[model samples]
Target: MEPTRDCPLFGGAFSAILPMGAIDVSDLRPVPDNQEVFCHPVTDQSLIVELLELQAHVRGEAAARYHFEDVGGVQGARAVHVESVQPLSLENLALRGRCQEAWVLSGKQQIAKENQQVAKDVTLHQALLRLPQYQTDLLLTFNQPPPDNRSSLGPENLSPAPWSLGDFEQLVTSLTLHDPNIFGPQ
Candidate 1:
C-alpha cells in the first residue's frame, strides 16, 4: 500500500499509495516512463499518479482547474459529472487540491438492441495538488466499482475496492516535496 519508488515525471517527484495487494507496473507499461502505476488485477482497476509541468501563468487555482478540465472524457468522450467537481484544501497541501468524480464508459458489453461495442460504466476520481515552487501539478487518478468488479465477484477474489475517499485524501495531503533534484539538480 506504499509507493514503489519516488517517481519523477514532468518536473517533480512524488510517491503514491496503491491498494494493499496491487501490482506495481511502473516499468512494465508499453510506453515506459517514470509515472508510478499500480493495478488490482481482479478488478482491472488501476491508479496512476504523476506530475505535470505547467506554464508560468498557469499557477495556483488555474492549474488545478486545468486538471479538472483535462480529466473529463467518455468511452468515446464524455463530460465530467460536473457537480462532483469541487475545491478542497488541506493544511498540509501546498495549495488546496481540486477533487473530482466523473463517470465514463469502458471495456465492452454486448447489446441486443444496437449490437455495437456497448460500454460499461466506469467511475473516475482524481485530486490535483498544485506545487508552485516546482511549477508542477501532482495528479492522482483512480478507477472504481461496477465495471471495476466489486459487485459481481467472489469474496475469495483477491481484489479490494480502492474507493475510500478518506484514505485517498489522506495520501494526497501527506505527500511532501523532498527532492530539489526532481528535475535533476537545477
Candidate 2:
C-alpha cells in the first residue's frame, strides 16, 4: 500500500515514506551520520540508508555501479560477495545496485549452532542512488537475520529484530530528497 509517515533526516534534506509500522529509532537514540535507520517495533525489521560522497570524475550510473563493485571489497578483499546488479528508478532518480546473500568471513566463528534451520539465509539488500547534481551517492542496506538478544524476561523488555527484505524495499522505493542542504537551506 502507501506510506503512513514521511520521516525526514539529513536535516530535512532527505526523507523517506515509511510504512505504518516502521519507527525511526533516532527518536529514542542516535544514528550514524548521514544515515537513517528505521526499525519495526513488532517485527524488529529495519532498513538503513546512508548518503555517500562521490569522488571527482565519478558520476551517474558509473557511481552506482562502482559503488556496488566496491562493496565487493577493494585491495583483494572479497568477503562481501556480490550476487546480482540491476537498474532501479526512484521517483526522479535512476540508479543501480547489487544484492548480497550474506556476509561470509574466513573465521566463521560467529556462526551459531542453533540447530534449527533458519527460514532463509541471512540476506542483505543494498542500493545506490546517484545524486550527481548534489555530488553525493546514497546507499541503502538491510540485513535479514535481525538483532537477536532475548536476555530480558518480561514482554516490556523485548524489542523486534529488524525489517524484512520486502519491508525494506518498500521503504527504499519511497525515498525522496530535498534541495542539497545537508542541514537546512541557508
Candidate 3:
C-alpha cells in the first residue's frame, strides 16, 4: 500500500484518504467549482470528485453505469466496457448517516487524448454516493493509465508503482461528509 493522508475536498465540506504526494490539480491549473481533481506526482493516475445533480431517471444499480457512460461520452472514448458494479458501504459514520446508498463500478475505456492517433486502454473506477437529502450525487472517479511508457497517458520510464483498486476502495470508504450544507438548501 502507498503512503496515505487525509485530504479535504470542497473546502472541508467533505474529506477522503488519498495517497501521499497526490498533487492537487487546482494548485497547478484551473478546476471547475463543482469538482476536485488530484494527480499522482510520478504517474498519470488521477482522482476526481464531483458534485452533480441527481439523475431522476437513474436509480439503484443503474446509477453507476449511467454516470460511467456519461464520463465515457465526455472523454470521447472510442469504446467503454463495464467490468463490474457493486454496492459500497461507507466506513465513515457521519457520511453513512446521511448517505445510505453508494455504488462503485470498474470499467475500461479506449481513449485517445488530444492529437494522439491511436486509442489506448485506460482503467476507470467510479463511485457514486447518493445524497437524496441534498438532491446531489457525489461522484468519485479514479483514472489509471496503461503501464506502457510510450502511452501518452502517463509519465515515461516510470516504475510500476501506480495506484491499485484497493486504493480506490480505501478512498471511497474513507469519504467523510463534514458539512450538511455542502449541497445547499436541503
Candidate 4:
C-alpha cells in the first residue's frame, strides 16, 4: 500500500454512528432489533470531512455519496459556525481563545487515553502552560511532539497533518470495500 494515497479521516475528530435504528426499522417494517443501528466494523471515515469543515460539506450530502451519516458527531466543534475556513481558524481572531485551549487540552487527554503513546513529555494540561502557542481545534493539533502530540485525537478529532475532505472520501470508499455490503440500503 502506498502511504501516499488518499485518507480522509487522516486527521480530524468525529464519529459516524448509525441512526438510532436502521436495520430494525427495516425489519420492524419485519420487527427485529429496533434499536440497533447496524454499524459496519469500520466506520466510513470519509464522513470525517464534514466534521472538519461543514461549510463546504454536510452530513446530508455525504449520505448519498458515502451512504452513512445519520448518527454522527456533527455537533460540538463540527457544528460550530464558520465564516470562511479557506485559510484557518486563527487563535487571536477566533472567539474562544484560552477557553478553546482548555477544551483542546481536555480533548488531548482523550487522545492520550485512546491512542496510547509511550512518550514521557508533558501532558496536554502541562503543554498548555509550556508551549509558546497552543491552538485548540482538531486542525492545529498533531505536530506537538509526542507527549505534546498526546494533545492529538483520532482522525475524527484533530490532526497535525495538512487536510482536505476529498481525501477522506477516497479512504472511506477504500475501507468500505472490506465491509459486508457497501451498497446495502441500511
Please say which candidate is ahead in lDDT: 2 or 3: 3
Tell me the tens digit of each residue's lDDT in model 3 across 35-128.
8787876666788888777767575467787777777887688787767777775553334656667777888877877877888787778887
lDDT by residue for model 1 over 1-186, one digit each (tens)?
433333333355443333355676855755345355767676576776675765665544465456555554212323333323445644435333422221212222111224444544445566655554555565667776533455656455565544456545544543544544455564
Top TM-score hit: 3
Give stretches of model 2 more than 4 Å off: 27-29, 58-80, 90-121, 145-166, 178-185
Candidate 4, residues 40-108, lDDT tens digits: the string is 223311111121222233222222222211211221122211121121122322122222221111122
Worst 10 residues of 2 by lDDT: 100-109
All candidates: TM-score: 0.58, 0.56, 0.75, 0.18
Show how many residue pairs clash in every candidate, following the order shown: 3, 7, 0, 12
Q: 2 or 4: which has the higher lDDT?
A: 2
Report the alpha-carbon TM-score of model 3 versus the true structure.
Answer: 0.75
lDDT (C-alpha) at residue 168 in model 1: 52
Clashes of 2: 7
Residue 25, model 3, lDDT? 87
Indicate the TM-score of model 1. 0.58
Q: Higher-lDDT candidate among 1 and 2?
A: 2
Error of 4 at 57 (Å): 20
How many backbone clashes can be found in candidate 3?
A: 0
